[PDB]
From a paper:
Imidazoleglycerol-phosphate dehydratase (IGPD) catalyzes the Mn(II)-dependent dehydration of imidazoleglycerol phosphate (IGP) to 3-(1H-imidazol-4-yl)-2-oxopropyl dihydrogen phosphate during biosynthesis of histidine. The metalloenzyme imidazoleglycerol-phosphate dehydratase (IGPD) (EC 4.2.1.19) has been identified as a potential herbicide target due to its essential role in histidine biosynthesis (Ames, 1957; Hilton et al., 1965). Since the substrate lacks a carbonyl or imine adjacent to the leaving proton, which is thus non-acidic, IGPD uses an unusual mechanism for catalysis that is distinct from other dehydration reactions that have been reported to date (Glynn et al., 2005).
To provide a foundation on which to analyze substrate binding, we determined the structure of A. thaliana IGPD isoform 2 (IGPD2) in complex with inorganic phosphate (1.75 Å resolution), which is a weak inhibitor of the enzyme (Ki ∼5 mM) (Wiater et al., 1971a). The native protein crystallized as the same 24mer species that has been observed previously, and this structure shows that within the active site of the holoenzyme, both of the Mn(II) ions are octahedrally coordinated by four conserved protein ligands and two water molecules; HOH3/HOH4 for Mn1 and HOH1/HOH2, for Mn2. The holoenzyme has an open conformation where the C-terminal region (R193–R206, termed the C loop), which contains a number of conserved residues, is disordered.
Numbering used by the authors:
A (entry chain G), B (entry chain H), C (entry chain C), D (entry chain A), E (entry chain E), F (entry chain D): 9 to 193
Amino acid sequence: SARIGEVKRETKETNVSVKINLDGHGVSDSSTGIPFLDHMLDQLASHGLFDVHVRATGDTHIDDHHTNEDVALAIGTALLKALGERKGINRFGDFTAPLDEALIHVSLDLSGRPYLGYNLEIPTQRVGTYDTQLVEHFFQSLVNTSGMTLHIRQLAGKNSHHIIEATFKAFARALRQATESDPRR
Amino acid sequence: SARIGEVKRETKETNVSVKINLDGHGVSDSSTGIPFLDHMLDQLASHGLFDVHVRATGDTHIDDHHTNEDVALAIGTALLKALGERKGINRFGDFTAPLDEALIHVSLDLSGRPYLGYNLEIPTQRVGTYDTQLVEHFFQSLVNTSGMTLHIRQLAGKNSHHIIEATFKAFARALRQATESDPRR
Amino acid sequence: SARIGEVKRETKETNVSVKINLDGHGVSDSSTGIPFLDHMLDQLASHGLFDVHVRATGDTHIDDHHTNEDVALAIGTALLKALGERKGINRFGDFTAPLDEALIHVSLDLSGRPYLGYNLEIPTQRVGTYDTQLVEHFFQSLVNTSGMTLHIRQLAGKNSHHIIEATFKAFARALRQATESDPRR
Amino acid sequence: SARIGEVKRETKETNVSVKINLDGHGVSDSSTGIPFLDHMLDQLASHGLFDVHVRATGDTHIDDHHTNEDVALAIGTALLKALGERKGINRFGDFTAPLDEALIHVSLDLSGRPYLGYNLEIPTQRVGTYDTQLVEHFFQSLVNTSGMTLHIRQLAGKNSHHIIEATFKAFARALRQATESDPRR
Amino acid sequence: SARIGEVKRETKETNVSVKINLDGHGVSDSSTGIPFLDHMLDQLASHGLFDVHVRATGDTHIDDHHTNEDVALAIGTALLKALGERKGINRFGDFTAPLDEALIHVSLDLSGRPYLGYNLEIPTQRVGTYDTQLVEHFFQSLVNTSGMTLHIRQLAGKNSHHIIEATFKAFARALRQATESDPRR
Amino acid sequence: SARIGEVKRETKETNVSVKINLDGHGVSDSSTGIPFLDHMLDQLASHGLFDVHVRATGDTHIDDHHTNEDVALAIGTALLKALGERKGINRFGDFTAPLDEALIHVSLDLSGRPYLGYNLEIPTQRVGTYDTQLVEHFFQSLVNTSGMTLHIRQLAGKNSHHIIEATFKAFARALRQATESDPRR
Ligand SMILES: [Mn+2]
Ligand SMILES: [Mn+2]
Ligand SMILES: [Mn+2]
Ligand SMILES: [Mn+2]
Ligand SMILES: [Mn+2]
Ligand SMILES: [Mn+2]
Ligand SMILES: [Mn+2]
Ligand SMILES: [Mn+2]
Ligand SMILES: [Mn+2]
Ligand SMILES: [Mn+2]
Ligand SMILES: [Mn+2]
Ligand SMILES: [Mn+2]
Ligand SMILES: [Mn+2]
Ligand code: NA
Ligand code: NA
Ligand code: NA
Ligand code: NA
Ligand code: NA
Ligand code: NA
């Protein structure tokens, strides 16, 4: 039976609905009001073979910060719920993905202890309309509600969109690994 | 009886109305034409337990500078009027507020001698559409019309929205302390 | 009615029982198998006016690490439970406590978002038999389950016991402030 | 019943009489033969809400050193006497006070163990006729007879009169906090 | 017989009309499609007492560059035409203007030989939607068609809007002096 | 006819009377209890062609600080009063004055927004009995009550009396310029 986590979260600032299938086929269906984040969430589905359904509405006239954070928090919680008792899984994931000149190493453990190690150096302040400080906030928030240990290490990269997208490819692949069944467990 | 200060400031550039209640319940009612400043004025009301009413429009087609300044000047005057003869109050306020990784120490004295000490280092140029140079200008202008001695010291912080918002939290709580009754005066 | 949180948690490594009263009288009843940690828990009770009850049976023949961690995790959860809906509280706490030459500033927010900022430099590796690396882990683990934003800043200090104990005094006092009723809320 | 400490002390060099009320109304009555010190003692009364009565005569034809020291020693003893058994008090005090561009953080504990941490950098040698080295000596001597743990930290300042006066404001306010009743003890 | 210069110039990128009266009363009537430039041209009128009429229709969907340049070229030519044979004028101008923290020294000679000396350091990339690289280009183009020797020296300044606007105030006042009659010539 | 501003102000520390005529003939009538300040106020009258009447008494046995500050505050208020609506004036003033080896550039704007930029480096602590820190405090306090934008820049100088006196000559001549009628307004 497919492992599915669903979360509805309403704050003063944002309304968020998430549904994630750990055992999906890469179905991407994300609409957050933040086009660059939607693009990254599509990468998450396609490279992780998760089914990702996200809806958010919020106060983007202020900036994208509150929406970014609330989506990430909800996603972490959805992952936690989908994982259930975590029986018979690999638990650890490790992958290095390129995107042209960018190269990003992600290592993670579905440990129940939140930690983010992050060293990206994104050389521009905006990719499209997306504030590049929000990348770290997205992963930190996801970590805090999922309880995962996550290390994100930039090995190479110059183009901001390549650095971020390569990070999502590596994260998706590492998370696929961690959530898959270990054949000897 | 509640201490309420009301100010109309009209310049070539901006039309401003402010009403502040020092003895409020955190009623937030601010519309400046600058969404991020509206968000910070909400934080002022919420964290300081002030009632804050602001209406402004101006030449935002140029940039946010003139409106940001005229709003700040009028708030400073409003505070001055609300304080009246300052009988029986703490006068001094001192608070350090975190917001995640950010940590800001604000110390103030309702002295009648304007001074701004400010050392924030905001690492991005825009939060949403808000020019981060305007944060210092907001506090300088407020100080100049209120006659407040104000020091703002950045102890930690990386996210620009966090640093600015922690500053308003700390300022609001320090100002609440300073405007409150001293039980021995 | 007093705000009391109780946690019983057993792992492969440790068997822990914690009960904390936020509205206590400083009743101290901590026995962890780690004498220096018991001394610090006593400081928490006495300086915070919490009633603190801790029992732990752990694998200290290996080292104190698993016991220290499991105690801290359970305390964080106990605090979370005791706080309930967090209605009407100060929420923020800020205190700087000396102990002779040592001086430690603690600032915290009962935010629901875990974060530890810690900069202690403890110049010796052992205080009695207690590994001084475990101080940071204690606070990190406590933050992670309580969901608090916590900043610990060393302003002065040379004696390791003084540095660590001053940190617990300042923490206890900042947490007492945060958990107390705000008379205007 | 008001907590009052009285000291008479005669040395080869000076004759000093001190009376301090911890529970006063800011009555300032200091005549030491050192006008700048009188001015600082007035600040201590007004900002601390102590009643301060001081008389000293001595060998100021030599310099102000012996008088300054003997006044400080007597005040320390007077505080210790007034404190009595220290039942039910806050014991710790912490305050940061501005005076224009100056900003001074004082932290203290009524511990019974004397310690002075002092880092003021006063950039002129005389304020009026008062030797600026005597500021440190005043606080050191006070600490030695009171048994106080006292930390004085300069955060900002350029004007010598401002730096010293802000220190006395912050000290008076921290000391008031420490000597006041803790409502839960 | 006011000295009036008029230029109508159309390129494949822009269509521009400028009319300047050296002997004006500050009448400001500038619409370029670049709101910040219009604000600066208003400053030129107000502080210089020129009558300034500008209209431009340009390709601002690309960026403000071609419009900014073509407006500046046309203003330079209009000044040249207005000056005519330059009989009896001061010819040199020199003014230092503050705007809050900003302080800008402008020195010019209506010499017939184009030169721009410019050392502004504008610390942000955008003021509103206005690219701050365009300030130097405005003055360079103006110099090139007018044939003036112009030095712009930043003595102080932190806020980009203040730096640029002070530059325009100082330029306008220096140009007013240079274009005015020398009573002895 | 003549623009005259009068201010009487008494505090616990000082008693001050100021009368200034902006349209004077350099009548000098200053007695502050601080002989070097008297001499500088004489320079203000003679170089500015202001009529300057000042009387002050106060606690100079403590030091000259309170007197210096209260005189400057009163002067600033008196200038503000005398200026009235500020109709038809130059508003800006700019002058560089030598005194032997000293050279001081003063630039100011009668703007309504207080700002002091000050970089004097006065190499001795006392000129006669006058504490050289008081020069800066004089100008800061004057700016604060007058609402002027004032920049004081040391270009050269070694002798402390010369540096200070040149500053007052330049300030006086700049203020004369700013307060004089613009013949085209
Ligand atoms: Mn956030
Ligand atoms: Mn892409
Ligand atoms: Mn401005
Ligand atoms: Mn926010
Ligand atoms: Mn282990
Ligand atoms: Mn561990
Ligand atoms: Mn101990
Ligand atoms: Mn001695
Ligand atoms: Mn004083
Ligand atoms: Mn082009
Ligand atoms: Mn070009
Ligand atoms: Mn402007
Ligand atoms: Mn002062
Ligand atoms: Na398996
Ligand atoms: Na009161
Ligand atoms: Na409450
Ligand atoms: Na008590
Ligand atoms: Na002429
Ligand atoms: Na005029």
